[model samples]
Target chain A: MQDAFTKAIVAADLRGSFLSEQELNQLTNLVKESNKRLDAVNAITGNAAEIISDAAHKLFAEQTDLIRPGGNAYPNRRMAACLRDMEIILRYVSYALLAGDASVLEDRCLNGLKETYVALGTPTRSVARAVQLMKETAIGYVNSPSGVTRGDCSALVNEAATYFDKAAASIA
Target chain B: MKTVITEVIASADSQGRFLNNTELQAANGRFQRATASMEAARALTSNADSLVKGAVQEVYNKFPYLTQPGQMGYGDTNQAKCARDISHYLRFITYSLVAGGTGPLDDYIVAGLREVNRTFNLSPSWYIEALKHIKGKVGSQLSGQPLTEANAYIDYCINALS
Candidate 1:
């Protein structure tokens, strides 16, 4: 006989079977929020990344402390990149929610967020995690008490916005 | 990556006859390597990821039966064409999927599916990492089976214009 974990792993080949109703709901909200954020951020950052690129033009003009004199543009680039990641995370979250695909959510959104997060501690990663948390909580609620996922989402949103603020502060 | 894709696409455009098969058995025989490679690749990425579930799910959800290609109509009376039924399923399914009908939390879904599709359609060579991983796993296991099986399939895919 196969090991139980192996058995479970094999069974997990099918994506939707193991998910609960709360997990499904998690998809809904994450997708909604991420979609809104990506369109918002991508439009914002695509321009910002460009402007950062253009900052080179002013390298000769201004001897300010923002770039070379500030030791390095670590914070600035960090902010920009984290912001871009923020947009990406949001878009993925929104898309996942909209698609309501449980398996994909666990693997990609969760894992990627954690990985990129190693580079910067943006609100985006935290927000994405909260979405996952809410999913688990909602699943918990469905499985047991299951507090409102919306409430969880709200709490996470506020918390993540704080991180986003930190991320933005680093660059701006 | 960009250059490789440009070359692969150009090759597909120029020499796709042999890659396109006539029957489901033959077609599946053709794509078996790609199919298994895709399955293994997805296992590492979106296949298991929940954030990517929606997009990944959308791929599976929309195109339920991604089985081999076959034909419709009578033998001679029926039309004969490229047995690209799986490709057809993927194309049609992707077309039908709502651009907006995505999942919320699964951010990886967006990137993962793009990767999956890249493996499936645009970038056949994009499946390289997955193949490499598979080869590495085999080599490390030390049971001493050569990497012949995996390499042979990859070689075939390399030669195939598509």
Candidate 2:
């Protein structure tokens, strides 16, 4: 089920060229709001932050050897490089979400060094799964009866899917 | 138009032979037509220089490091220098679109992106941001088909940076 934020992101994409002065401003405001919401969720529940952070860390911990599997030319630190780009990919998605501009995605690492690591048999599915793990952990944490409002949980989920999907695309 | 862009984008992976002598001639001939159309399109706009400058400024703001001191071999006062580089890149983007071939243009974009990655090791997001800004700026000025064609060209350039 889609929430209002996800629905808006979809609508904004379909409405193309909404990049006028006022529109870009609105999108910028939305981005700021999303960030604040993200922060608020983190503050209200340390579980959500620790869950996402731990998942990301585990991704690196589990993938260092896999980055150069099967006679790959990547160095030992290749997994580190991949993680770095993954972080950048996440940042770019945030920028695009905030700017309400897919063009913000235009110069993202469509294919960067990570592609090499991926080519050497890195699993894009695993990356998506990791992001999903974070998303689910956050959603469950936020939605518990003893926790924040469902509306807040919805907001967090919508933002998570929006950027997480973008990152997954980059990795895939 | 879609046919040509599709052909070019499909061959994106293997651009080593995008323009042979004959293809070069063909692309050049088409590039001439594209530029001619650009001229006509430019006349409709108020000021090409200002348009280009504003786009450049947007780029600098998005990626301040581009104009940061000594990063690209110029001191703190090299915003204009940075603008010129972006302008040059923009020209090649349109040129590739008009040329009916991605080979020559892909070479330029990939090389530029390579240098950018080498220097900054950052995402190409800001570069794409600048390109999109230019497309929006010119899309309004250029009427009808050229605007569509220009967007296609810029999109191809953006894709090539991948």
Candidate 3:
């Protein structure tokens, strides 16, 4: 009864510790596979793309817990506003990345509210890079100050989950 | 571990208590876990019920070697077996406690259900869906609509003794 999302989640969870050696390989492969899969889905069906978008938004609303904690944080707080800001950008950035054309989600919402969402040191090459950048930002946060632990993991997971949701939400 | 139970049991209605979504989610998370445990409990009770009945039948039938000497004491010598029957009896009682204590919550939910019934003006399922949104977040924000309803139910669920 479970689906690919669930399966990927299980696999990722089982592999453990993206920071570690074995898991890094697994993470790389997963990211690669996910990229390929998304590309394939975009090409294969007209409907799947929309479904992915719609599902992503719904998932973002509810399942934000998934990619949270983001591995850990370095300091007690990166920037009090940083996390809040992170969540905000992550909201739309995730939508765009999971988007079929990618640009549609970015152009409408991000462009519509340019001042609010955009940040300094902005990185917007591709959707996959964007997600990785968020993950890396989370990793930086983890290594920054207090170094959030289990809590950081929640942040990371929720952040990634937001992206998955964005992808899934592209549906309708 | 304070979990969903903490908010529900500790909460008071209409006094502006917290009844946060996180609390409700935590409780429902526990409920999901407890539901799985209760599933196990269900199976255990069913087995125990059957075993106890079977043992009583064996006694009634006067089956041979039931009370044999040096054979652990009766048809069933396992202390574990003895414990299983008592354990299940207590489990049913435990389940009943959850049923009994939820009366106040049930009452409030009924009111919400009624209100939703009027507001939606649609099928029973339509009303139920509305109620389902905040079915769990009781005591403080039942009036919040979706958040409180779900919050209250999950909160109440986590704290139940069983």
lDDT of each: 0.30, 0.54, 0.33
TM-score of each: 0.21, 0.37, 0.22
Cα displacement (angstroms), candidate 2, residue A33, comes to 40
Question: What's the residue-level lDDT of A152 in candidate 2?
Answer: 44
Q: How well does candidate 1 score on lDDT at residue B106?
A: 24
- RMSD, candidate 1, Å: 21.4
Every model: Cα RMSD to truth: 21.4, 16.2, 20.9
DockQ of each: 0.02, 0.01, 0.01
- Sorted on DockQ, best first, the list reads 1, 2, 3
The clash number for model 2 is 1
**CAPRI tier for the interface of model 1:** incorrect
Model 3, which residues run further than 4 Å from truth? A1-84, A87-131, A139-172, B1-37, B40-112, B115-162
How does model 2 do on interface RMSD, in angstroms?
19.5
| Backbone clash count for every predicted candidate, in the order shown | 44, 1, 71
Once fitted onto the true fold, the runs of candidate 2 whose alpha carbons sit more than 4 angstroms away are A1-172, B1-47, B63-77, B116-126
lDDT of 2 by residue, A1-172 (tens): 2333454656777888444575557656666566345433433233333454555667656655444454221465754554454445444544554444444454554446347546766566666666555545545544552222334445545755666565566555
Provide all candidates' interface root-mean-square deviations. 18.0, 19.5, 18.1
